[PDB]
Amino acid sequence: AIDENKQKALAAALGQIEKQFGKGSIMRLGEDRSMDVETISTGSLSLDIALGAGGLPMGRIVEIYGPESSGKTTLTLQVIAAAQREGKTCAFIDAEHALDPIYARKLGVDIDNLLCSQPDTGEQALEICDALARSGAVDVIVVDSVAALTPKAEIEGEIGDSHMGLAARMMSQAMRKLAGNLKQSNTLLIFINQIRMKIGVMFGNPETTTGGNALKFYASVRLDIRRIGAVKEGENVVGSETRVKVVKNKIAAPFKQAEFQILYGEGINFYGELVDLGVKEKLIEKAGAWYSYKGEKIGQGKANATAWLKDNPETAKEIEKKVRELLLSNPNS
Amino acid sequence: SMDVETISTGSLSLDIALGAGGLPMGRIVEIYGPESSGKTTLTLQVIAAAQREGKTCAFIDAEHALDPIYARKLGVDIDNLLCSQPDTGEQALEICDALARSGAVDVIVVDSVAALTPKAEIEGEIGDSHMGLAARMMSQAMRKLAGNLKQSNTLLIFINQIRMKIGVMFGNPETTTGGNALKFYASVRLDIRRIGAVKEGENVVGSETRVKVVKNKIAAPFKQAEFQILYGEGINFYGELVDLGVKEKLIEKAGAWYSYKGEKIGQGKANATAWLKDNPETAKEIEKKVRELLLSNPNS
Ligand SMILES: Nc1ncnc2c1ncn2[C@@H]1O[C@H](COP(=O)(O)OP(=O)(O)OP(O)(O)=S)[C@@H](O)[C@H]1O
Ligand SMILES: Nc1ncnc2c1ncn2[C@@H]1O[C@H](COP(=O)(O)OP(=O)(O)OP(O)(O)=S)[C@@H](O)[C@H]1O
Ligand SMILES: [Mg+2]
Ligand SMILES: [Mg+2]
Structure with a gap:
């Protein structure tokens, strides 16, 4: 008797919210098919198994980090190539100013259809990301190095001048804005990041990443990539033995690893x-x-x-x- | 009406640590911690435990990172779990007030207070300065909600992310986002931290977790709880x-x-x-x- 005006007040409140802020403002989570997890291939079968859901999630933020020459750029060009073969559009924000388009072609990327940008400031780089995300016309965006996203005040100022927290603040404001837009357009955003040492540390790992703490929170996947050896044809070094650790996963169980070869010119074997x-x-x-x-x-x-x-x-x-x-947890076809 | 009602957290070790045997209904709760500490998992454990007692629950996902399959694995009935994905910070808090006023829902959860972006900042540019707009918006929402929540008997749980203070010599350099209004209005405040791994020889299958009660208006604060979160299966x-x-x-x-x-x-x-x-x-x-033996006040 008394539990019925409960259901009435619920349906009335639902009706009020769904006409104030538009159709699908509130739903029930089991019925919302925009909340389901679609994925795309990394170009490595072993890494697709380690991620659990069979690839990288669409509509989410992903961080790849590691030491120098560990394969970060090469891994992101292999996901662009795989998505282009499935008839998706891709963008590459090159803040490092170090993309070779001939090498990208050899890894299997369609160079004539890839949107490329070399922005002057970190604000410009993150405003292009927002504009492409809102458009609904781009499926995969890659930002090559958070570390090279330098605020306008730091560009205008002199070397030596202190701007402590400014890059970390810029990133914190950008995540807030992007996370909503990316989910709405079903656009995957990949941030590449570099490693730095923290001074005066006795306990734990001295390794950290650049651009503050916001990205660690907002990321749905975080990958640690490392070069663990050489691939030789006699004495000629022909490629690199590579290990990837899934340090954070929100779509499946973490702490699984993947091992593979990167062959210079070809990419992932x-x-x-x-x-x-x-x-x-x-x-x-x-x-x-x-x-x-x-x-x-x-x-x-x-x-x-x-x-x-x-x-x-x-x-x-x-x-x-x-x-x-066998090894795919839930094969979707 | 001012006699306190509690609902179980899912963890027994944390139910003892609070003293009253759960989180108080008609109040505001804050749950902060570092990256991958188990904030979302703990709040889905609460929703699960609550809707087993014939209660309605809501989830306001401002983080844009809730998996409905994992929710079901923890034991959440997703067929009648209300979910919203708001565009602005103002939408999220107006939905929280509208659900609270109705007197139909018993539990509401706002994932990441850090991700509640004001309207002006969203239609603005990245680089533009909006000093304290997030804190004012929260301060306005807290004084409007606190009264509406109590007479409804609706629990509101805020999840918060940690940031660091620049050029501090004293205290702890850790902070929380969204101003210090929530700090005052919050009845209970939990601080979750991952303190180790749970292995099957080598295969990592879980997380050793520690929860600290830094504030408590309902009982004696500054008590701890230690437990294992297993990846799928849920709380142990x-x-x-x-x-x-x-x-x-x-x-x-x-x-x-x-x-x-x-x-x-x-x-x-x-x-x-x-x-x-x-x-x-x-x-x-x-x-x-x-x-x-460890119940403070047996209800019945
Ligand atoms: N244009 C190229 N031709 C042949 N080999 C290349 C080329 N570019 C990169 N490589 C090799 O592929 C391996 C991985 O390189 P990258 O993918 O560039 O790694 P990375 O971590 O992005 O390194 P950074 O940005 O320079 S720290 C390295 O041994 C490179 O020398
Ligand atoms: N869908 C999932 N399947 C398996 N494990 C998961 C899933 N989601 C999260 N986990 C793991 O469970 C542990 C706790 O995760 P959460 O409850 O999401 O913690 P969290 O503090 O909310 O992390 P955030 O929101 O990314 S800062 C972590 O070690 C996760 O890797
Ligand atoms: Mg590179
Ligand atoms: Mg969370």
Whole structure:
């Protein structure tokens, strides 16, 4: 009897809010299909498994950070290339002023359709991000280095002058504005960031990132990338052994890691991952340094085994399809 | 009307730490901490525990980062959990007041006070200065809500993010966003921190968490709570039922070996909590003992 005017006051309050601030201001979370988690590929199968939901989330903020020459730019060009192949539009804000367009083409990016900007200030860089996000016409934005987003007062001033907290304040104001717009247009924003040392530290890690604490909070995924070794063809160094740690995840369980090769000119070695995952799931048998598929001996060593999968497109498609079926938590098709 | 009503936090260790046995209804609560401390997980645990008692709940996601699948995994009934995603900071607080006035919802949660951007700052440019507009907007909202919340008997939980003060020599350099109005009006104030990992040998499957009560108008403040948040599954209330059982000398622990009523239960905490899962009888009767010994005022 008394629990019914409860439901009436609810429906009346819902009617009041939904006509004041527009149609879908309040809903029920189980019914809201704008709140579901769509993803896009990173260009690494191992990293797609480590992220749990099978890729990077659309409508969210992502941070990639690491030491120098660890593969941060290369990893973000591989996600742009994969999204372009699925008929999406992409932008690249190059605050570092260090993008080589010929290398981007070799990694598989469509250079003629990628929107590029080299802004003079951090305010200009974050105002272009907002304008592209609100447009609804751009799916993936990459900002290359938070560390190079310098406020206008610091550009106008002299070297030595103190502007303490100014960059951190600029970033804190930008996150507030962007987070809403990005979700509304279903646009993925990737911030690359550099590492700095904190002085006078006995306890914990001395490593930190630039641009303050706001980005750590607003980010849905945070990735730590590191170069853990060289890839050699005799004495020639031909690429880099790479490890990625998922330090923060809001769409799945964190603290999983991914290992892969970056080969200079080609980018991420896809078939190299396909072997290592095939070996792990008992689809490829390893007899010391002899790889074999269904008894049929494919090669001697990982490089020859990878070279074999390259000249057998049908056999590689078969193994990919199974590894995908097995290790993907919730395959959506 | 001024007699206090409480609802469970989901964690038993935190229910003892507050003293009254939960968060007070018709009041304002603040829950701050660093990155990935378990602020959202704790407030979805409250909503879950509340809507199991036949209550309606709302979630105002200003952060734009709520996963409905994870909410269901923690035990939130998402089919009748009200969710809003406001564009401005003013919309978020007008929806909070409109829901409070109606007298229909019992619990409201505003995720990130840091993300409540004033209208003027949104249609402005990045670089433009709006000194204290967030603090005024919050100060206006608090004096308008405090009265409307009490007569409705509606709980409002604000989640806050930590920022750092520049050129401070004294005290702690940590701050909270959205002014010092919320600091005054807030009845309870929790400070969550991740203090370690929970492993399956090497595989990291959880977070060792510590909650501190820095303010309490309802009971004695400056008490602690320690517990485990597992990634999916949610809060580990069996893991607490052992830790409080051994603290009151109902359970015994001899190194890595557990024993209750003479007969041993398992080796380590993971096997000890796994046996409590398989024995609802002892898990019922130990809950009985821990509650009736450490309850401040038994309602009925
Ligand atoms: N244009 C190129 N031609 C050949 N190799 C390249 C080229 N650009 C980058 N690489 C290599 O690819 C590996 C990863 O480079 P990046 O992706 O540029 O890493 P990064 O972390 O962005 O480094 P920064 O911005 O310079 S600190 C490095 O060993 C580079 O030398
Ligand atoms: N959907 C999910 N699936 C699995 N684990 C999760 C999920 N969401 C969060 N977690 C983890 O649970 C722990 C607590 O997360 P939260 O409750 O979101 O904490 P938080 O302080 O709200 O973090 P923020 O909002 O990003 S500053 C973290 O270690 C997360 O990685
Ligand atoms: Mg680079
Ligand atoms: Mg949160």
